[model samples]
Target: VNSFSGYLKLTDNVYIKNADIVEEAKKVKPTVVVNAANVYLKHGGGVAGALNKATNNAMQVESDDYIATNGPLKVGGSCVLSGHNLAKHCLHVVGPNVNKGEDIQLLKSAYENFNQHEVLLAPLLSAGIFGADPIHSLRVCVDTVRTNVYLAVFDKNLYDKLVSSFL
Candidate 1:
């Protein structure tokens, strides 16, 4: 019946699922969810947009305050905010725009922020709209995230790619 190799097999507390990050954040009465956020914390598009809609933009109000208080986040910068409807807090992190630069260090720096948290529901930082390679980003995420975390991979190809590379 099943044709393709599915999600990654893991023995550790860390896990993977094919999902839009925001959708799963709502589905699982959960822990911290990573927001693929801009420096402004605008929550405009991509996972940020979905989270904005789901959290009723009230979260954005606080995101704005964090930015105003601390100034705009630089690449690899991060901040935490109340989860509103999503439970726990949302770790908003800014990643490097790889299409314009070769700074994988910034991507790595962003994942390092994950180390400061507990249970995390995260996506591939710096991938997707930010133009980093998903496969490479996934590798960074796997290696750097020492805490218990779940990666909500929204793209089916990325899901398959994870299987092809890791399984």
Candidate 2:
């Protein structure tokens, strides 16, 4: 029998689920998936790294061209690219890096970039390797995103904790 509360629904278009972001991309086929890029648009590490590797680095050349002409993106700023292997488009944003002295507000700005899109999938920003509090970041995402938002959680235990927190 089930013992925990049901899944947490942030809104009609937003919900939390236990799955890897890349895995979910295959199922949902979102129009745009958030790519955590550095200011220079290099998808070198973290979620961006995984996306870069998965898409055969399709974003690298275009991202570099954009950055060269426009300069590096400030925290929370973004650029969009046509998708290759996953979603139809990729939204590359300069999210906060706790290790690099960036703060939570930068993450908040990343979520704001979700506007004007139909469907998007994102992980809790700065919650993983970057070391920001997942709960807090999720809260910000819930508050900011205006489109259909799917929060992809890869760990079952962590998913339970997040769902239970809302109980």
Candidate 3:
């Protein structure tokens, strides 16, 4: 779903669930928008499935290529990575979960990639799942991002504070 040349949808000009976000981004003169569904750390494989679905859906937007770390493509048996077409370039970070202390490497990958971005409209942080608190997540994200770019989240209040104070 990138702005660049690719498959043109004949049925409708817009597609997927995050079209609103894309629409708003387009209006605000944004260059790029990072969309993350939600991260759920609950017991049973159901949580992972839900996360995968949400990830795919969020990634299923129409936008340009954004940098991504090695993300999990497979969650369970026969669960292939879906909705990768949402972005021009997809980064899949595979490693230990957030609790395993591999978060630094993942952040490093994200920061390094983000630095290469010429014009980043906003960085989307997906929450509303099982994990650490918002402040902790926001801090971790801020510490990892070496470059100066805007951070976009689903929450408006948090985004405003993050942009005003953290940026």
Candidate 4:
């Protein structure tokens, strides 16, 4: 959250940050910006809300149409929506919520499902309001990601906390 590069290299293939999702993602210029969405893909709050606001609510409108056609997504499920100036595609991925006692496998699947892009941007899956611990979710991503990844930590306060805990 301080004045640093929009991203930090934690490894050769990984970057991490909790800066403005829209600004930082555009700076990274990934092939896809991963959206940790709800089953209905509502761009209502958290990661979804920020993206929706920046992209003129195209996410909610497109997500609504996608669900209308394909029905709601399941955990570990996915769909693709067009990205705005920030990135190429918005890869919609439904992740698990520990509040519902969901398994980490669903998060892992969501991580793997949309990672074929050359440069990928992601928010921590199933953390924040979804109630999964960041430590767990971060590890799941580390285990699953197959290419360069920029992890956008959803909770701003957890920025340094996470970097310290993980590093």
Candidate 5:
């Protein structure tokens, strides 16, 4: 209902925006709410930071536990925090770092991990801090998502493109 209004179907069963990710995720209460993160379980900025703050940093707590056993997660590596926040689970993917620029394969791999889940909410991988083209990143995400996928569009420029052409 806020900045996430205006849904544009990127592909069959793949809806873009339509509602704020967190707001919509809260309402639907999906099995997992996925977002990109960095190593060391740091959530100082970007979606990772927002979610860290939103869930009262429970994500980081879960991630820390994961790191203790598994060590630092590599690109596409993930950890789930079930029943941690608004969604039943918080699925964290270690996507491309901001300094790494575009890593399309790794980004795709991150989405690939969602195959087993019934429903997932994900952001545009590597598109923000990692500096990959938003539309291109969206394509990779769309291709990998198998089940119900809600692709949350946070960038206004990309949102405008959807409004003009796809919506």
Candidate 6:
């Protein structure tokens, strides 16, 4: 993905494992790195309910004891919950399902009415595959926020900037 800062060229055009994503993000010093904002921060109750329902039906309900499910990572605030469970020594980003009826509708409508749709999909702001909408807004937020970031290797300033921006 090309951005104001520079184009991101996937080394091998392949999906690196989860560890790879973390490793790469960590390696490149970014002033403000972006990850999952809120599994479904834009939409709250509805999203959670729906996501859980689908997972349940698909028998994909995250195991309560799953290594990361119960990890120490805890993130919750204005929009949603996300991030790894440090306490559990596992990576986990908790989010709401998208099957909620009115709640989901309310969240979506709020986005459109309040001009937060784009904001909602921005990293550290509220980014994720929330609905059927295109990724234009999402991309904008990511680019805008990440532009100031610096790519480097274990730069204390970079790590602090990106990591703390999440909260």
Q: What tens digits encode model 5's per-residue C-alpha lDDT throughout 90-139?
A: 77777676476536578778777777677678777676776667767667
lDDT of each residue in 98-153, candidate 6, tens digit only: 43221332333222221312111112112234332223322222333322322221
In order, candidate lDDTs are 0.79, 0.75, 0.35, 0.78, 0.70, 0.27
Candidate 4 Cα misplacement greater than 4 A, ranges: 1-6, 26-29, 154-156
Model 2, 1-167: lDDT tens digits are 11112336767667888877776676667777887677887788778787777777777877878878888888888888876677889887777888788977788788888876867777777777777777777777777887777777777888888777752
Window of ten residues with lowest summed lDDT in model 2: 1-10
Q: Determine which window of 10 residues in candidate 5 has minimal summed lDDT.
A: 1-10
Please provide, for model 1 over 1-167, each residue's C-alpha lDDT reduced to its tens digit, 9 standing for 90 to 100: 11112335453645677888777778774668888988889888788888888988988899888878888988898988888888588888888877668477888899889999867878888888889888788777877778877788898887878757863
Candidates 2 and 3, the one with greater lDDT? 2
Give the higher-lDDT candidate: 1 or 2.
1
- Candidate 1 or 5, higher TM-score? 1
TM-score of 2: 0.86
User: lDDT at 62 for candidate 2?
Assistant: 75
Question: How high is each candidate's TM-score?
Answer: 0.88, 0.86, 0.40, 0.86, 0.83, 0.26
Give the runs in model 6 whose Cα sits over 4 Å from its true position: 1-23, 39-129, 132-136, 139-167
Query: Cα deviation of 78 in candidate 1 (Å)?
Result: 0.9
Return the top candidate by lDDT: 1
Q: What local lDDT score does residue 14 receive in model 5, on the 0 to 100 scale?
A: 75
**Top TM-score: which candidate number?**
1
Model 5 deviation from native, Cα RMSD in Å: 3.6
**For residues 45-139, what per-residue lDDT tens digits would candidate 3 score against the true structure?**
22233332444545432211121343323221011122332333322222124543334334434334445544343333323342334454455
**Which candidate would rank higher by TM-score, 1 or 6?**
1
Could you give the C-alpha RMSD of every candidate to the true structure, in order shown? 4.5, 4.6, 11.6, 3.5, 3.6, 13.9
What's model 2's lDDT at 84? 64
Which stretches of model 1 miss by more than 4 angstroms? 1-7, 10-13, 100-102
User: Model 2 misses residue 14 by how many Å?
Assistant: 1.5
